[PDB]
């Protein structure tokens, strides 16, 4: 169990997502709602979905038939969330593959400035202090001008970018040919695929921390006295980082629920895995913010303006640290194979969870064998053709729209609040803890009980209405505001998951006969 789950949610959310979410929200002030959500919400909801999966004989959508069948569409919300997550997560792996393929030459493309994609506003990082501030480092400009080929907005997609579509097709062929057409990581989990990631993260940590000027980067990482907690993007960003890095409004953990024994002690395992994930995120944060401190000390700019305040921070600071590392070709090869390994394990787990939930939703409607093989290809083709809209020149804009709205926004707060509310105030903390006592052995303490009852609903509704009364718009890299139609598209992406629960509530109320109180009573009794 643990071996396929310690790679299942220790992935790109810790080495790529938490870095720029910490960077976008001021570094030190991001960790306060991070740890508040982690202790009051994240490990409670982690144990909550794991036990919801383990108690029910099935998992995913139909696990809400043995627990409050009225709210059966938390599984459907999880399906929508994991579909959009699969799309933009695999285009992160596309960028990692594109970085890996450009690393095989001896001189790295982001090491020096005299390249074809570099504007005349470019100098090397060791020359920026000498020349006296409207100038670009080679890592940021390589990223935005060769990897992204970043355009002037989401309304100008330009052209579908060549060779990123081929990298996305490569990672999708790897995913389609190693999920159900073959086998996942089975015998390679020992001594590789699970400790080579942590050895590489330790190498990046002991490189970034020994870089000059890393102390001010750690000071930016751990001092809350900037980006003050009166603006709600920090709270909702940290809450969605918790609920994203744990895959815990996703249905994946409920899918790797039912694949456990009934009387299996899965509390110490869940706390160990959650503390391992939080330690991985926090240690990778030390690494990447030490590198950003080095970058700001080298370039002479401030730490908050040295790189991309958006999803390029793991693709700017980590390649920069590779550049200031001995034999940078070798270490870039290992680092982007590492990003591919984390992302591929997490994507295998998410697509396996989505496919397991979709075949538990429709058993024998799609015949196993002949038509089970067709469905994986259909899902991979659909998510690839909706992943090619992040490949284009205006592809980071659509990707950041997905990353803030599709599977890591108010949808995650909505699903977490509704899971905790359903369990606590319909299923009952007493009755659910009786089930937990039957399975684990002990009733969970006042932490889990009062977290599902009060703390995680209060946190989720508080941050949800806090990001609405003091509304802030989605901005990319602190300079590009999004248009009204892009904000509407992102809110439609969020509402495609949040409105899975009231839609199934009105569907189950319309499809059942009787008065409304008797209807609700029948629909909330577990089966």
């Amino acid at each position: 169990f643990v071996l396929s789950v310690a790679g299942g949610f220790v992935g790109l959310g810790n080495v790529w997502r938490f870095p720029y979410l910490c960077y976008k929200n001021g570094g030190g002030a991001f960790l306060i709602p991070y740890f508040i959500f982690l202790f009051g919400s994240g490990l409670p909801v982690f144990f909550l979905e794991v036990i919801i999966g383990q108690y029910t004989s099935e998992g995913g959508i139909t696990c809400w038939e043995k627990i409050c069948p009225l709210f059966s569409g938390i599984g459907y919300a999880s399906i929508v969330i994991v579909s959009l997550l699969n799309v933009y997560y695999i285009v992160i792996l596309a960028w990692a593959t594109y970085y890996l393929f450009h690393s095989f030459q001896k001189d790295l493309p982001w090491a020096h400035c005299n390249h074809s994609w570099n504007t005349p506003q470019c100098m090397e990082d060791t020359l920026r202090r000498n020349e006296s501030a409207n100038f670009t480092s080679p890592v940021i400009e390589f990223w935005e001008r060769n990897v992204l080929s970043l355009s002037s907005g989401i309304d100008n997609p330009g052209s579908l970018k060549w060779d990123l579509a081929l990298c996305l097709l490569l990672v999708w062929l790897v995913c389609f040919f190693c999920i159900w057409k073959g086998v996942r990581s089975t015998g390679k989990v020992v001594y590789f695929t699970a400790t080579f990631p942590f050895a590489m993260l330790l190498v990046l940590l002991v490189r970034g921390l020994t870089l000059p000027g890393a102390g001010e980067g750690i000071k930016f990482y751990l001092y809350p006295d900037i980006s003050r907690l009166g603006d709600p993007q920090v709270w909702i960003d940290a809450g969605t980082q918790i609920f994203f890095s744990y895959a815990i409004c996703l249905g994946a953990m409920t899918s790797l629920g039912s694949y456990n024994k009934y009387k299996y002690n899965s509390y110490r395992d869940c706390m160990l895995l959650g503390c391992l994930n939080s330690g991985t995120s926090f240690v990778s944060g030390f690494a990447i913010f030490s590198i950003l401190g080095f970058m700001a000390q080298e370039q002479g700019v401030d730490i908050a303006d040295v790189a991309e305040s958006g999803p390029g921070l793991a693709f700017i600071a980590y390649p920069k640290a590779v550049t200031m590392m001995p034999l940078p070709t070798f270490w870039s090869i290992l680092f982007f194979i590492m990003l591919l390994l984390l992302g591929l394990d997490s994507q295998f787990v998410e697509v396996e969870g989505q496919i397991t939930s979709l075949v538990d939703l429709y058993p024998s409607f799609l015949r196993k064998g002949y038509r089970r093989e067709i469905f994986i290809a259909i899902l991979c083709s659909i998510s690839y053709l909706l992943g090619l809209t992040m490949v284009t020149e205006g592809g980071m804009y659509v990707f950041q729209l997905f990353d803030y709205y599709a599977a890591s926004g108010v949808c995650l707060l909505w699903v977490a609040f509704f899971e905790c509310f359903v369990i606590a105030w319909i299923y009952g903390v007493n009755r659910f803890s009786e089930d937990i006592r039957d399975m684990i052995g002990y009733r969970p303490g006042p932490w889990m009980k009062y977290s599902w009852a009060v703390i995680t609903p209060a946190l989720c509704v508080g941050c949800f209405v806090f990001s609405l009364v003091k509304y802030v718009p989605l901005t990319y890299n602190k300079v590009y505001r999004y248009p009204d139609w892009a904000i509407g598209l992102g809110w439609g992406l969020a509402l495609s998951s949040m409105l899975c629960i009231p839609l199934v509530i009105v569907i189950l109320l319309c499809r059942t006969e009787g008065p409304l109180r008797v209807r609700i009573k029948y629909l909330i009794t577990p089966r």
Partner: antibody
Amino acid sequence: EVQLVESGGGLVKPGGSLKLSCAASGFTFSSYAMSWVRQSPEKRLEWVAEISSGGRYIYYSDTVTGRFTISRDNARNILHLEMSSLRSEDTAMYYCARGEVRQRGFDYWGQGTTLTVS
Amino acid sequence: ENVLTQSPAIMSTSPGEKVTMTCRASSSVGSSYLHWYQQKSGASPKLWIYSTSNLASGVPARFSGSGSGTSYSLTISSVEAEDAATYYCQQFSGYPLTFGSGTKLEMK
């Protein structure tokens, strides 16, 4: 103070019916999974039947599966154990035992109700 | 069921002498799910050692446990006069919960 008080002990005929009453106080009775553990007259201790915190998950021993009925009354905190078809090799000393955490076990026991079958 | 064969019941321990008893389970107990109980002379049993290593409330530190999986033991460092009792090991894992046999640790 946690103290489990049992009653209903006595002598019954073989195949008869008797109802025990483990009255409990000193803890939140609705949040602790009760059990009944009997002790044979040769002092070989034997678990009979447990019931979960809410009373939904009920287990019995293999010897007394089809004829013993454990029940609770969480309103006034009394544990019961219905017996029917009570055979000769069921005379014992029946303790009610509070075991909720499976890693802790029956950390609080009651007194004895000496049941004799003649 | 899980048949828990135990040490011979009647053993005579001199006061202040290090003695121990075993508990062999037929199946595999998870070693956080096996407990030891003490029943005095004619009184009710009480929990003594839980999860085969720990100690309950009021249990002296002279008592200790070891073993895992199949063979489980209770170890007494020095027997005092308040130890004339009968000890039952008890697995708690399988839903037919089974206590062990008696171990009437008596005196000389």
